[PDB]
Design a binder for this molecule. Structure first.
Ligand code: MET
Ligand SMILES: [Co+2]
Ligand SMILES: [Co+2]
Ligand SMILES: [Co+2]
Ligand SMILES: [Co+2]
Ligand code: NA
Length: 304
């Protein structure tokens, strides 16, 4: 395999960590290929669930717990910590809150969260690589609780970073916040990609095309599909009671991606850096509620 940049996988992986059976599991957890039957059933529907008051409550609870678990991981971002050690603590922190870590065995994904360094766009597999000064690292957390998934991510700084890093990370966050700012009943899902691409292009950056935000609730990924680039052809219109993610991946170079032989790790075909942020959103009459927001702090971690 021709690697697109410096970064390499670092094996062996620690034996897959188990989840005590007192935690409720999503379907895919015991499917031998990790397929979700309930997700396959709704495949090829463009039709968007309206959350009940009880759905909202489940989404609120799971998303707040997912925040807590991401806040845990954010505390560990220093040089010499391995993505594995992060995922270990994430895995434990999910157990303590009676949540199943949603990535675990999702289509055979073998770990409990996604850790993406530098040129990795998304879906990095926690491994033995110690984080190095100047790295950017995204941790993507998803928890499953009492039927509901909650999904968020932030990129972080590893020690001191270069001016390029700061600007990519900053800009990626602004792209997310600007798209969230436009969420309200009436808007076309396809519009967020216009706003995201417009601000990224303005700062000299590209928008990854092969990965999209998604609806999320009883299923981990479902409708809508929500592309992050301009003049996309997404279908649907926002309504109060829709829940979905915005999760833009932005790049220092071009937008093209390819997947490592592990079948998961997406990287920039050009080897340049990509940053991502993600929130799960609920549409309300006024605008939208950020379910995965911090409650204790004005800003994402990187801002401090
Ligand atoms: C291998 S699981 C990846 C899920 C990720 N949290 C997402 O936003 O889709
Ligand atoms: Co994903
Ligand atoms: Co090494
Ligand atoms: Co997501
Ligand atoms: Co995510
Ligand atoms: Na990255």
């Amino acid at each position: 395999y021709r690697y697109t940049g410096k970064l390499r996988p670092h094996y062996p992986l620690m034996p897959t960590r188990p989840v005590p059976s007192y935690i409720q599991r999503p379907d895919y957890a015991d499917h031998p290929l990790g397929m979700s039957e309930s997700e396959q059933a709704l495949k090829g529907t463009s039709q968007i669930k309206l959350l009940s008051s009880e759905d909202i409550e489940g989404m609120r609870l799971v998303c707040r717990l997912a925040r807590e678990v991401l806040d845990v991981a954010a505390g560990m971002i220093k040089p010499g910590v391995t993505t594995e050690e992060i995922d270990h603590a994430v895995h434990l922190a999910c157990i303590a809150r009676n949540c199943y870590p949603s990535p675990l065995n999702y289509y055979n994904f073998p770990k409990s969260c996604c850790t993406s360094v530098n040129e990795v766009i998304c879906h990095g597999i926690p491994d033995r690589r110690p984080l190095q000064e100047g790295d950017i690292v995204n941790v993507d957390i998803t928890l499953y609780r009492n039927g509901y998934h909650g999904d968020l991510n932030e990129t972080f700084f590893v020690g001191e970073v270069d001016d390029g890093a700061r600007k990519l990370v900053q800009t990626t966050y602004e792209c997310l916040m600007q798209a969230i700012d436009a969420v309200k009943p009436g808007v076309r899902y396809r519009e967020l990609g216009n706003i995201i691409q417009k601000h990224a292009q303005a700062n000299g950056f590209s928008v990854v095309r092969s990965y999209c935000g998604h609806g999320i609730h009883k299923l981990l990924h479902t409708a809508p599909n929500v592309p992050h680039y301009a003049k996309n052809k997404a279908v649907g219109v926002m309504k109060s009671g829709h829940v979905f993610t915005i999760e833009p991946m932005i790049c220092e170079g071009g937008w093209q991606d390819e997947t490592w032989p592990d079948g998961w790790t997406a990287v920039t075909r050009d080897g340049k850096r990509s940053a991502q942020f993600e929130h799960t959103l609920l549409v309300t009459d006024t605008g939208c509620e950020i379910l995965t927001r911090r409650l204790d702090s004005a800003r994402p971690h990187f801002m401090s």
